[PDB]
Amino acid sequence: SLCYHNKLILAPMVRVGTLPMRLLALDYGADIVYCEELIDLKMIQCKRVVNEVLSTVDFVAPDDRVVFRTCEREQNRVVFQMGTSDAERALAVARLVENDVAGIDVNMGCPKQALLSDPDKIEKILSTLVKGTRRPVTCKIRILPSLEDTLSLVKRIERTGIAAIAVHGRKREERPQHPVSCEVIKAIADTLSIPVIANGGSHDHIQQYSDIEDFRQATAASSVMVARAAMWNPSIFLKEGLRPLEEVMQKYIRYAVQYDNHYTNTKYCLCQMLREQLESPQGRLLHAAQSSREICEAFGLGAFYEETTQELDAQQARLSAKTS
Template sequence: MRTTGRGSSGPRTRRTTVTSRARQGLADGGRRGSVRHAELANCVEGGRICRVQQRRGMIVNSLSLCYHNKLILAPMVRVGTLPMRLLALDYGADIVYCEELIDLKMLQCKRVVNEALSTVDFVAPDDRVVFRTCEREQNKVVFQMGGMGAALLSDPDKIEKILSTLVKGTHRPVTCKIRILPSLEDTLSLVKRIERTGIAAIAVHGRKREERPQHPVSCEAIKAIAETLSIPVIANGGSHDHIQGYLDIEDFRRATAASSVMVARAAMWNPSIFLKEGPRPLEEVMQKYIRYAVQYDNHYTNTKYCLCQMLREQLESPQGRLLHAAQSSQEICEAFGLGAFYEETTRELDARRAKLLARSPEEAEGPVEDTSGIIKMAIKFDRVGQGQSSGLTGPASWLVQRPLDRLFCSVVTVAEQKYQSTLWDKSKKLAEQAAAIVCLRSQGLPEGRLGEESPSLHKRKREALDQDPGDPRTQEPAMPGELCKKPFVALASGQESPLEGWMAVGAEHQPDAIGQFSAPAGQELRGSGLGQQPGARAEGCPECPISLSGSKQRS
């Protein structure tokens, strides 16, 4: 069972008198008998009429968000982030649910107004954005919070206690989402108890807990629930069997006698399914999604995941292979012909951030030396975006653990200068890596990001042709911009490191104190790691090992 509450505050509502004739006209399309022992009060919201349920003379936890006759984007893990929600709203969805979030994680978050993006962010202690919203989805987004899955279905007492507490403790409309139980009698008994808590609506996924998408959805069970309850019932689960286009959504609603329909996988595959005119071409939809992802600084791994769900069987196409190989937002944009858009948007965001930082110099991202002589920066080590090979041996370092959340912060000393990241990390190793990057960045050295010299250097998932020189396939032109996925770097002769004394002198590669790998001075350094020097040349190598931070794998 999942509980939900509307994610943003809306305008004040004003109740008006309801005539007997108006009571007969139900908001779910005029169907009579589906809302028993209930009255529908009109709610004036921004000049438009919204019906709000009323029982026994009291408003049933509903403000301006109405769940009658709505097209709804379902909550989906890793899919229901801000870009997908905005895209669904553009294509005609009335309400959008965010991905399910764990309540404990939200309790640890800090609410941050992000002026650069014009968003409100809930940021975890490790500096990761857990939930991001903006004004565009105000009064239309539902914040989905719970304990994951259908575990509570076997504990109706706890369900009733949780929902009753939520309804009494907030003025926001509260809904819940359930699956059906093995028997219809048990299901109807459960939903009656849920209705008595005073929730605004209930979403029903017409499958049992153990059933998967390939199992048929039970329209009969949803219909029985809709005919039993007096609150709106939202039908869910029809993407595989029933919903292929916009008109199918209404057919599914009628088959289930529900008030509204919640669409999950069909919308994940193509969010334009909410359009009355019919779905838009997939490439157009994906480009629009990418634009939102870049504008709102969505992490590239989440962007890539959602785009892969849209491509589905086309993942083996040339564009699908480019997407699968992409290791940054820039490469995703380039794969879809949006490279210029990425550069322009990035420049605008950087300029906006610089303007804000100039207004608040204490929050500047550049190196700042405090009174203790420690150079500090807000750096988070990205275990995906950083290489693990280096030509620099480990500096002296020490760690501090914060008792409250058990996070770590490291200070490294190089040439009698101390460096520290102001961001804390749950990993000792990554905290040390972040401090090392502060040192490199303050010295103006490459910090070891994969593909730092060229975006195509780190396409490590791309399959290279390892064939004999005589093989005719080796004569075919490579994919544009593609280089060897296993590059190495050779230092130019006579080149000296600005951090002299950090270079290893041994005859073999040695792991250093912070998990990097160093090489003898003047010899080749494999990978694009922290030790890569300005002016170094990159060459293709069929045998060079590259591993990511925290891993001993070879690519």
């Protein structure tokens, strides 16, 4: 049901791509939102729990930590990314989450101790997945050192029946400071019979909404996935123009509290948004903050925090045995 053509996509990002960021990207016009990479070996340990208090579906590890949290609002739009090096374990993890997500993605940059380097194994993991789940299956790659090797590999990958491929147009051995190769992404999109999601354009190509469609045309790709630009301000997806960072940060913080996001993750994401402004008044208050309450107070959201905490407590009582 998920279509990968002509879309704006939030790229998978460790730490950044937890539920609050995903929901905020959807608010601002992203069509598809990837979660952070999560490890198959960790996910197989988790229990699926319907959390009626938060109105979420939680995947909860044996140490009681919530590894992945989702909700009905993103069900039709969220793509689950795993790091895997074992076909049958990947498939078990996909079946664990498949009823709560719209797509399953494999990060080819992830090791086998990169998967990208081993077409035999890629073909096995991806064909096992494609055959075994009712959701579309994608993968995400970095380009190889030679143009010709890159084109042969993607032809191999494509024959596994995946629905789309995201291509970060940088070689493994080069920083984000090196220019992105639109030439290569164009050659891949020209070659492949499946949609290609261009990636790697933030900063050097993508500073405002209209840069996204420009990058898509330069790459001749079907869609564009955005990571760093969205991490800095997820209203990058909004056709009408960027929103003021204060509005965005407050909206982020509200989601983080309403979905009981761990405060260290909330703080990490805010620090990425405030990257040029750690010395601003709010920057310094954030730095000192050691709890979600203190994060909220740093942004003028103390009354919001108290009220929401009371709401979530009252919801918990309402939904307990005693009320029955």
